[PDB]
């Protein structure tokens, strides 16, 4: 693996075979393992794509890693899924692992589908970030976000360096899914890709004013 | 890419505590943590975003060999790799591979020769 | 004893990969591996066969103390033992215990004295 080092607020990747007497490393406290969000990059972060970013396969052990720090989350994800018969789709979250502690938004989801045997991985090979742990696999009833990892030194300078939704699956993207946000058991919404959390909080509240089964609208990074 | 870095870390610094360390006179759930913010001095954070997307490959491959689930020793191992690069078991103070500063030694040596 | 060494290892070298590292666009089961063969140059492999049968004793005893199941830190620990033998916290560059090569320093020193 590489390694990057802060120095005068400019980063420097230290190629392995290369030698730098100039470096300094006085403690592990200077070292950090940091987990990053895929929200600072401007990717799609909606429930549909979140289905599309993943797949299944078996014959693969589970693989887990630990991180110290990260970045606050705009959005998050959680699942509770079975098959058509009503049989589970996923593994069980072991001990220790916990929901990602920070979530300005939560795209919690339920439903079922075929769920072919395997585990919920990422297309591009990203990670699945939990309370101070990340991995390549989903576990039921748990918060997380998609992300990557960094590895750093810091110098001895003086800097020190909520919401819930609901949905239902529909067959898990077999070229095919209808998504439906839930307000109650007699209310749902045809979900639509380009619509925000905030848009649909407004939607919740305005129908929550207006007496409450399915409806429609009948018709860009957030740091701005 | 975002320049902004509304980030966090864990409250595991040094002098930040009275006696709140006691296990169940402490949160353990949401009050063990630390926040922070920065801004993209010198394209730095977009640089490391690039860096991490480049890291993922060699990461998973370096990972894949073992059978172990919950890895914790990688960071040590990286540090030991650093030192073995620095310190394989033999040093050449002149051969610019060992990274020592003996140059000023000649100061006391010339102080002795003028004795 | 066999001289022949039809052996194997794991494909966890460095530059051997394009993008096949991706978890489930990769085997993880039988295609993560490496093979190889050698022949008994200098009685070497029968030597290490003897070596391992001799190792087993101290291995299990060094093991037995802990309660831990799946050991992974032994090899590090061996390396740190090596370095502490090399580096206990104090060095005697002359006292042939610290293993440095400063002898050629005298080259520049005599270059200075002839100044």
């Amino acid at each position, epitope marked *: 693996i590489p390694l990057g080092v802060v120095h005068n607020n400019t980063l420097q990747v230290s*190629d392995i075979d290369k030698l730098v007497c100039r470096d300094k490393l006085s403690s592990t406290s200077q070292l950090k393992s940091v987990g990053l969000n895929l929200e600072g990059n401007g990717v799609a972060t909606d429930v549909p794509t979140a289905t599309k970013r993943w797949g299944f396969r078996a014959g693969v052990p589970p693989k887990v890693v630990n991180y110290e720090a990260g970045e606050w989350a705009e959005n998050c994800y959680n699942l509770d899924i079975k098959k058509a018969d009503g049989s589970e789709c996923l593994p069980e979250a072991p001990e220790g692992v916990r929901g990602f502690p920070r979530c300005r938004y939560v795209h919690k989801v339920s439903g079922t589908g075929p769920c072919p045997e395997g585990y919920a991985f990422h297309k591009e090979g990203a990670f699945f970030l939990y309370d101070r742990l990340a991995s390549t696999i989903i576990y039921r009833s748990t918060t997380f976000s998609e992300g990557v990892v960094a590895f750093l030194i810091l110098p001895e300078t003086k800097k020190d360096f909520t919401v819930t939704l609901n949905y239902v699956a529909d067959n898990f993207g077999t070229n095919m899914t209808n998504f439906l946000f839930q307000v109650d058991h007699l209310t749902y919404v045809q979900l639509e890709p380009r619509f925000t959390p905030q848009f649909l909080v407004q939607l919740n509240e305005t129908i929550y004013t207006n007496g409450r089964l399915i409806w429609k609208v009948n018709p860009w990074a957030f740091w701005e | 890419c975002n320049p902004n870095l509304h980030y966090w870390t864990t409250q595991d610094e040094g002098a930040a505590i009275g006696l709140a360390w006691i296990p169940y006179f402490g949160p353990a759930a949401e009050g063990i943590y630390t926040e922070g913010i920065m801004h993209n001095q010198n394209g730095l954070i977009c*640089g490391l975003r690039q*860096l991490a997307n*480049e890291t993922t*490959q060699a990461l998973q491959l370096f990972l894949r060999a073992t059978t172990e689930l919950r890895t914790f020793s990688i960071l040590n191992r990286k540090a030991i790799d650093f030192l073995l690069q620095r310190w394989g078991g033999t040093c050449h103070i002149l051969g610019p591979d060992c990274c020592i500063e003996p140059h000023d030694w000649t100061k006391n040596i010339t102080d002795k020769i003028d004795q | 004893c066999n001289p022949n060494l039809h052996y194997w290892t794991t494909q966890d070298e460095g*530059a051997a990969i*394009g*993008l096949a590292w991706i978890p489930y666009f990769g085997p993880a089961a039988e295609g993560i591996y490496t093979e190889g063969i050698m022949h008994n140059q200098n009685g070497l492999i029968c030597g290490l066969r003897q070596l391992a049968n001799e190792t087993t004793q101290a291995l299990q005893l060094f093991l037995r103390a802990t309660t831990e199941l799946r050991t992974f830190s032994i090899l590090n620990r061996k390396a740190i033992d090596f370095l502490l033998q090399r580096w206990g916290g104090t060095c005697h560059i002359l006292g042939p215990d610290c293993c440095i090569e400063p002898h050629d320093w005298t080259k520049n020193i005599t270059d200075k004295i002839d100044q």
Partner: antibody, heavy 120, light 106 residues
Framework: VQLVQSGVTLVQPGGSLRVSCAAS????????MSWVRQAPGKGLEWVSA????????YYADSVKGRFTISRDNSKNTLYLQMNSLRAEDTAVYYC???????????????WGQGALVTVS | DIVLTQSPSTLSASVGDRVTITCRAS??????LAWYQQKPGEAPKLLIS???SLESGVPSRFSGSGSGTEFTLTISSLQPDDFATYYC????????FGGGTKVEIK
């Protein structure tokens, strides 16, 4: 988006050389680079490549240990020092970039000019 | 380790015709193949990523496809410029090449 082959030369066997390939008109640090061989009289093969910032490097097996990839993202310039030469080393050597962003990729976009490096 | 297999090594044709190429290898790949072209002493160009995604500047006359080990290419209509050399490019594990393919008339 312009690429620059610089240092084609005939050098005796066992020689050594540093090619440099420059670039322009794009975010060079935000891309990968590589070196690729065309032996005349036959086809292609991949040699070696780099991360976006000089951390990670990659080589082919045939010349592993011989050659030394190198880059200057300050100049946005590519480099390749090269050790002892042989016959198969007689070939063109291009500098190119990948289609993916942040140097995490393959399946090159474009090419340069190529330098029929040779021995005698 | 893995070795492509262009099939055939050259063609003879005539403009406007529709032409197909097949490319194979030893082990399976997940539609992570790419195609290229160059001429007798010209620097190549990208054509397709993943054997299905053409690129800017590419004429739509071409058509790539395939899966696993076998992979393909088809040209709807020919052109004089399209009579150059084309190549199959693994990038799965050992981002290698094979021989290549060529066009003629007689």
């Amino acid at each position: 988006v312009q690429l620059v082959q610089s240092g084609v030369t005939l050098v005796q066997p066992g020689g050594s050389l540093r090619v440099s390939c420059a670039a322009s008109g794009f975010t060079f640090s935000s891309y990968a680079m590589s070196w690729v061989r065309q032996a005349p009289g036959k086809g292609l093969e991949w040699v070696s490549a780099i991360s976006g910032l000089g951390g990670s490097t990659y080589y082919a097996d045939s010349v592993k240990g011989r050659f030394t990839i190198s880059r200057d993202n300050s100049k946005n310039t590519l480099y390749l020092q090269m050790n002892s030469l042989r016959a198969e080393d007689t070939a063109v050597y291009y500098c190119a970039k990948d289609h993916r962003v942040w140097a995490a990729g393959y399946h090159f976009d474009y090419w340069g000019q190529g330098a029929l490096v040779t021995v005698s | 380790d893995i070795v492509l297999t262009q099939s055939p090594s050259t063609l003879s044709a005539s403009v406007g015709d529709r032409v197909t190429i097949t490319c194979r290898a030893s082990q399976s790949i997940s539609s992570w193949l790419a195609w290229y072209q160059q001429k007798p002493g010209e620097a190549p160009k990208l054509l397709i990523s993943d054997a299905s995604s053409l690129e800017s500047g590419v004429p739509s006359r071409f058509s790539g496809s395939g899966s696993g080990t076998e992979f393909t290419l088809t040209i709807s209509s020919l052109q004089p410029d399209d009579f150059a050399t084309y190549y199959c490019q693994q990038y799965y594990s050992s981002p290698t090449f094979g021989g290549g393919t060529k066009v003629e008339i007689k």
